[PDB]
Amino acid sequence: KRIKTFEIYRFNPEEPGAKPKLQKFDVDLDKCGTMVLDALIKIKNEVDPTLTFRRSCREGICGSCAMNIAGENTLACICNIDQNTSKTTKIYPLPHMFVIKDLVPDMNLFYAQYASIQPWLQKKTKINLGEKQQYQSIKEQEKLDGLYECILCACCSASCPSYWWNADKYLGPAVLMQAYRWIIDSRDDSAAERLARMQDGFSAFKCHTIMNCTKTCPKHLNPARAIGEIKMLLTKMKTKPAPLPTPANF
Amino acid sequence: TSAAVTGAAPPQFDPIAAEKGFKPLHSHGTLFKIERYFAAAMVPLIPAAYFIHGREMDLCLALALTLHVHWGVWGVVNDYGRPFVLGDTLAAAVRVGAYIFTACLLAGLLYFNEHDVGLTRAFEMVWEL
Amino acid sequence: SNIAQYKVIDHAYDVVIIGAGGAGLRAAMGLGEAGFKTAVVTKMFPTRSHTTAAQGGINAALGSMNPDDWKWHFYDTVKGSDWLGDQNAMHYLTRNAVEAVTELENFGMPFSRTPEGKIYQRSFGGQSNNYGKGGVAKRTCCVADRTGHSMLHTLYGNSLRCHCTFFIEYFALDLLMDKGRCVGVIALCLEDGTIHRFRSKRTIVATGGYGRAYFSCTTAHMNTGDGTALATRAGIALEDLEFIQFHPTGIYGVGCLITEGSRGEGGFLVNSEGERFMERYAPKAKDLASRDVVSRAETIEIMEGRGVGPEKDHIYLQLHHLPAEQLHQRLPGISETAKIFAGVDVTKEPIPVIPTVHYNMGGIPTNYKAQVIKYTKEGGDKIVPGLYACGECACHSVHGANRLGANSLLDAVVFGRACSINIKEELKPDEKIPELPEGAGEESIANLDAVRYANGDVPTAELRLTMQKTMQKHAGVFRRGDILAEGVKKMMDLFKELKRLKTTDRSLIWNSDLTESLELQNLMLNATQTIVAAENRKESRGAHARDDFPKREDEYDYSKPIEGQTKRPFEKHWRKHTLTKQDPRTGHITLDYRPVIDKTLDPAEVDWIPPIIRSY
Amino acid sequence: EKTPIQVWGWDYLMRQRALKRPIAPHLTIYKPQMTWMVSGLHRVTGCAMAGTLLIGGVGFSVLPLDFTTFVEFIRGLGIPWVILDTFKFIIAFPIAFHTLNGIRFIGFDMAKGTDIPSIYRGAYLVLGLAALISLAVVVYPRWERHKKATLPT
Ligand SMILES: Cc1cc2nc3c(=O)[nH]c(=O)nc-3n(C[C@H](O)[C@H](O)[C@H](O)COP(=O)(O)OP(=O)(O)OC[C@H]3O[C@@H](n4cnc5c(N)ncnc54)[C@H](O)[C@@H]3O)c2cc1C
Ligand code: HEM
Ligand SMILES: O=C(Nc1cccc(Oc2c(F)c(F)c(F)c(F)c2F)c1)c1ccccc1C(F)(F)F
Ligand code: SF4
Ligand code: F3S
Ligand code: FES
């Protein structure tokens, strides 16, 4: 008998005049896996099957299960349950998002904002599609390390107070760090036009260096560093290097 | 039963259709640069105003604090003066109020310099207590 | 459809794609490029798809590390299939592998690079230079340890340019059939409870695997064989479902995959006696043997008291001998996963691993143009008008009895694209969109309603867990005719308990109790058909091992010379695709058998590869 | 003038209002951390210092009172010495901290020091030095004024 107790944010839109509410759930830790997703599934399976959340992978790669656990934005599937049963871990959705049901937040602005950076390779001199590999050195591709790993879970954006107050106009860390990921891609010819898209006072510049994004990121990544890097480029304090030239034998 | 209505595509952002007439060139870049450069230049001006008082520092603090705080509050006002939460006209009325804040701040500082002890002096006098 | 009311919404599209994994998005890009009004229906945001969880790489003979030929890749693909594979489909795949992978890089895919600036490649299990003569091949193109994650995000991004319209978190219920012809798909929108009928000229099934049929697997929770349940309910027989790939190195406690690439960079398996035991079971290829071989070697070592850990019931993948620089640069994903789930620093310790259900060679059968087919002895192959299928949900069949590492991501793109090429060329603007039958989709709603309000005394999570435990016990790495037969018995009982189903959540809006039961329905179809096909195959081929029929049973006995033998008739040997046909109401399953396509697409370009004894 | 996405984003928020969906809790539920507590402070201080200058500036002009009588009033209240240096310290800290942290945040705008250790060093440092300086500036004259109350000379 090691009975852990979880407080889980609930909301049912079907119910009339329905309000959010906290619901306690007791879980026997000795017949339950180690990660908080395991408690959520156990609870749905044995106690309450109305309990509703996103999940898909088991290994913290898909990003489906982002939510607020014990105050912080992380992934349930790799969040170790707190063994200490005199505490009661609280489980809320991603902060400041409109909710569909229980821990499932509406996620379509996040995805739209993601569309707006045009997250795809662009070339000024049209390339012949299947024919050959574009040149890029190691060091140039290693500028993509720390950037391409992002699973688009939105823990970072949903932790950012700047983004709470102005989601509609501030792009937030997840989208900005991806915006940067195409900007420093040596192979991409459109740095200028990509930066133009976030010239205004809000898009990027509403980042008030709160730094919550880089603390909370469950993939140990750094949106804040990318955003600073973006600001420099926007103010013209820096510029993107030109791509190393493709050797004549290549 | 399937005696029901034809539906539309879900709402979705077409980032290429957005490019069809997205001219606007409005770089906030340079402005972000001065705001920061001005705050960097104010780093020496704090200890300076500790060690050297007078009616000419009182004027430099007032010019600098006014112009800094002007940018400062405009930003705070744009985080809490959201049309979503206050509606359109009241959020413009909060925006306008930012400029009132700046202009009244200066007026009240110049007055305090000219017709009272001054900033640097007023500090001494509470420190003497 | 009685005890409640449902809002129904009609859409008219050129082509509806069911799925947004590597395959579905590739098809989507092709179609939207080529002008089509393409819809993409998917039960989760495309990035969440299982493709994103892929690690090791994608195969192409780019010769970035050493010179290579795509015909060498063709060979290894076919050999790996244990000659159950269709050589015309394996031809199409490998010929198009260099272009497809280069296309990916051209879409922005941030591949690891070599010092010449070309695409880095690692070694992987069951591949070789010069038709099994030469050394261990390096064809496995990767973005380190996260090749799928990158590929999918690359593809998803690039799909936002093809003006392809996305219906996200829409659970597909059934294909809309009109006299043997698919005219679209009906689906449940999770956001708002609405039921949606999509009228399309073409439908592509790209729904991934059914790995959650087992108790332990590497697959996502969403890998519930929905697309093959779709095809079943449409009166399409499925192919080769008894061929379940057990990936050698899934983490012991949890299931989390450790990439074959970790062996491909010099890692190896180790028993309790401290032996690199794969040198015995496979002297030439060792720990880079084919997946079905290595997973068995492991399974024996357990059986014979050489397992590791407290219970002595798994083994060690040992990477710590490799330098940290390489471990970090080539395997940062599994480094962290080993850390999070097994408490292992891979630079200092070994990872506890064990054969785990991973990939599904079986699925909806298609020709080499990815067109779904029905089969009789009299008629032969017969296309199902309008229906295409690709990715893991399909069976082309490019993997036959055993998939080759880094061929699936490839399979998904090549044939995903191939769908778009073949539709561009067969569909003309003359043919207009199919007006639906009257009543179309009415039954899928009936099913929903019945499941939504399900009364019984067996909850959906319980009946799923017995299915999974059964499957694990009776249809694992080694199988015997009596355990199988008992397994078929218990499994056909569990198909009855569907009528005693209990759901609790009664909402239409984001009701995951409801959907997870539709998934359980779909899983039972997949699993049932899997085990009776497994029960009946009295031979051992690829991933399907029979203790009571150890031998591979072909038309000739290819262990002895060919000249001077009498070809056994079709009915006697087993080099043939299993076809499982299930009545979805009753659960009854019939069988039949369809011949393997041995010929290549073009003998002028490459010769076919006659069966030999499979050794690594 | 908005970007196309910023127009789209607005409609989104409106659609959401239409659907009567609640907004997921944030301030009331999120863990207090050295990240946003210090940026919380940077905004509080900056604003309180503005506020004081505006209220102070406009107040002493709009009222018949002057600064010298105001200083005399609280002196006349004869309140304990330690309590008076606490009020001084509260006045000084906001100036010290916000200025110090202001350079920290400029560093962040330039992408300097954004790794988690750095963040946490610069936080303790800037918070520590601010407290240090504010103590020095409040206690140095009071050590120089007790040096006349009782003294060698
Ligand atoms: C851990 C791991 C690593 C792997 N690594 C590799 C590798 O390195 N190289 C390699 O070649 N292969 C690898 N594989 C195998 C390979 O990734 C998959 O077989 C392949 O990605 C399948 O892609 P897909 O497009 O067919 O479907 P998936 O990527 O499985 O996605 C299926 C899609 O179908 C949709 N869908 C399913 N059911 C429904 C429904 N009812 N209604 C609507 N939509 C639905 C889903 O929403 C999803 O978008 C790996 C598998 C695993 C588990
Ligand atoms: C002496 C050196 C100073 C420096 C380097 C400095 C620097 C900064 C910086 C960089 C910001 C913006 C950070 C952000 O966007 O969150 C800021 C905001 C601000 N500063 Fe200063 N500042 C100084 C002094 C002052 C003073 C004396 C006041 C007096 C009233 C003041 C009031 C403000 C206000 C109101 C803001 C806006 C707060 C916010 O939006 O978070 N500052 N300061
Ligand atoms: O969240 C930040 N401050 C903050 C913290 C807590 C409360 C708070 O008041 C509220 C509030 F309680 C509300 F209910 C509001 F509706 C509202 F409009 C507020 F303003 C502001 C914050 C902290 C540090 C840096 C930048 C910010 C900033 F600017 F806003 F982005
Ligand atoms: S950055 Fe870290 S947190 Fe923000 S999305 Fe990418 S992964 Fe999730
Ligand atoms: S949390 Fe927010 S404001 Fe900037 S640095 Fe991090 S994004
Ligand atoms: S479920 Fe995939 S990230 Fe947690």
Structural features, described:
The PDB classes it as oxidoreductase/oxidoreductase inhibitor. The complex is a heterotetramer of chains A (250), B (129), C (616) and D (153). Chain A has eight helices and seven strands; from the N terminus they run ββαβββββααααααα. Chain A has 250 residues and is an alpha+beta fold. In chain A, the strands form two sheets. Chain A has a five-stranded mixed beta sheet, with helices on one face. In chain A, strands 6-7 form a two-stranded antiparallel ribbon. In chain A, strand 6 and strand 7 form a beta hairpin. In chain C, the strands form seven sheets. In chain C, strands 1, 2, 6, 7, 8, 9, 16 and 17 form an eight-stranded mixed beta sheet that branches. Chain C has 616 residues and is an alpha/beta fold. Chain D has a single domain, classed as 3 helical TM bundles of succinate and fumarate reductases, CATH 1.20.1300.10. The longest helix of chain D has 34 residues. The chains are: A alpha+beta (250), B mainly alpha (129), C alpha/beta (616), D mainly alpha (153). At the A-C interface, helix 1 and helix 2 of A face helix 4, helix 5 and helix 11 of C. Strand 1 of chain B pairs parallel with strand 1 of chain C. The site of FE3-S4 cluster has 15 residues of chain A, from helix 4, helix 7 and helix 8.
